[model samples]
Target chain A: MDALELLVNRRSASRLAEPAPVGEQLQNILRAGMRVPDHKSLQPWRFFVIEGEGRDRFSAVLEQGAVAAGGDEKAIEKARNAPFRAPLIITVVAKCEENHKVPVWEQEMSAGCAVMAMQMAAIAQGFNGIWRSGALTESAIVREAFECRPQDKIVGFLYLGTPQPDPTPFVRYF
Target chain B: MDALELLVNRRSASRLAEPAPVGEQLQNILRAGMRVPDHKSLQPWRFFVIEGEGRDRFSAVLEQGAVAAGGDEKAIEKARNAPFRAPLIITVVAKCEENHKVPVWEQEMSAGCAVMAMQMAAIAQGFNGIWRSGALTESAIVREAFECRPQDKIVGFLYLGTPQLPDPTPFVRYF
Candidate 1:
């Protein structure tokens, strides 16, 4: 497919299953992510690769976060199972600094652009991806679980895997 | 070119000239930008399209900002001529809201992603683009000139036009 076609036709896999991109494919995705526009070469971002049994371990962190947030049993259960939706989950972190030439907000923006690049890379590599984040992104427990620093911010979690075939077409909104 | 190759081989155009993408092509780029992965469909971005004489007007705004900031004659001249670098410059804004389900930071991220998509779309559509932001991005005069709201954050300026090709290849840090 052409680059614009891949970009314009790219759809977020609402449901993802096993068979995630690995080896060189995964490396390319990460490389493309790091290629996002960065100001002052600050980089300003990093990612945590969670796969295999690690998803389960990360789920426990989500569960802990839910409990800390006083989420109901149903919500806690939902949190525990969230990471299971995909074979691989990439936790994006916007590593920011104070008193820098580049504003911290711009650093965070750079990280967000990186997330988009990774999503595009996954599509190019024949994988599907969904970038997701919610209230838990602000949970103290979640922050501690991710070992984030005071100045660091959670960008989003990229869920990657094979797409579950759905006959329904993606609606384009412009 | 292949999709992956276009993406991996993509490089920002160092020099951009007149005859920007217009009509259907411009619409396609904006549509691709909106197609970015937006969580909860918040759609936290809007764009300011500056073209034709608008570029000249915006440069005047930049000039005022530069002078207000105590810029020297050289700096002021640079500001006054900045917008002429491209025929069409799209200023992306991260329109955020307070007390929303999605945090403001994430909303801003969505806008940033949208900007990146537009840049890629320009490349895909045979147009060249460069994403630029600097101190003027935060200038009150500049923001006012763009008619930005208090909550609106300027993501960057997407300069779109024809590319002035350079011989050297884009250096790739990753294999």
Candidate 2:
């Protein structure tokens, strides 16, 4: 795909299925993510790859968080099924330094830029992904599951898989 | 340029000169910025365009910020000359809303993504630019000059212009 075409027409696939990006494709996606602009080269980002049974474990953590928040069985069920929406989930974390000359916000933005790069890379590789995050991202149980510190943050959960055919174009006018 | 080639070879041009992107190129740059993956479509980003005389005015603001911070004459001079480094500047601001369902971090990231998209779009259009920020970005005076609210933040000032020849490529080894 042309770079401009990918930039202008990249759409999120809500109905993602199996055959997720792996091997060289996955590597290229991650490499592109690491290529984002960073101030002072702090590299204040971390990626957590979750797939196979790891998704189930992550779902369990989500359920625990929901239960702790006094969520009912339905909430727990929703949490459990959340990761199953895609074949793979890459959790992008902003590993911030409290006293860096660059503000924590900038570091977090760098991480977000990395996520954007990863999404574009996935599209370039003919795969599709969507960035999804909700209340669970802020839950203590969920944070611990990903081993994120107090200062660190879960930017988003990138769900990756093959797209359903004929995905709708994302509409935007400058 | 091939999509991957652009992605892989895209490098920030530190030395920028006149003939900055304007009119159509400028519009497309911003349009590409608006095309980012915004969760919930909050559009929590704002851009401030400074050029020509506006650059001079903004440079004065930078000087004021430097002086207010007890900066020495050299510091003030540097701030005064900062905007002249490029023909145009796009100040990317993250306008965050508190108590929103989406975390402030995510919203801020959306703004960053927008800035990145604009940078790429500028490159695609045969222009060059770099993202830059210093202590000035965190200064209250600078923020006030840009009319930023308390919750808003200046991510970086994108300096855009024609690139000087012989730009060096940034080397990265991805295993």
Which candidate leads in DockQ? Answer: 1
The per-model DockQ list reads: 0.29, 0.27
- For model 1, state the Cα shift of residue B143 in Å: 1.8
Docking class of 2: acceptable
Q: Stretches of candidate 1 above 4 Å error? A: A165-174, B166-175
Give candidate 2's TM-score: 0.90
Give per-residue CA lDDT, model 2, range A1-174, as digits (tens): 887777667688878997999877777777777778888888877778788888888888888899998888889899889989998888888888988888787788888888778878888878888988888888898887777888899888888989981111221111
Question: Which residue runs of candidate 2 sit more than 4 Å off their true CA positions?
Answer: A165-174, B165-175
> lDDT tens string, model 1, B39-133?
67777777777888788888898899999988999999999999888988888877788778777777788888877888888888888788888
Q: What tens digits encode model 1's per-residue C-alpha lDDT throughout A16-132? A: 987998887777777777778887878787777889778888899899999989999899999999999998888877888878988888888888887778888888888888998
Tell how far residue B64 is off in model 1, in angstroms: 1.8
Give the C-alpha lDDT of model 1.
Answer: 0.80
Candidate 1 docking quality: incorrect, acceptable, medium or high = acceptable
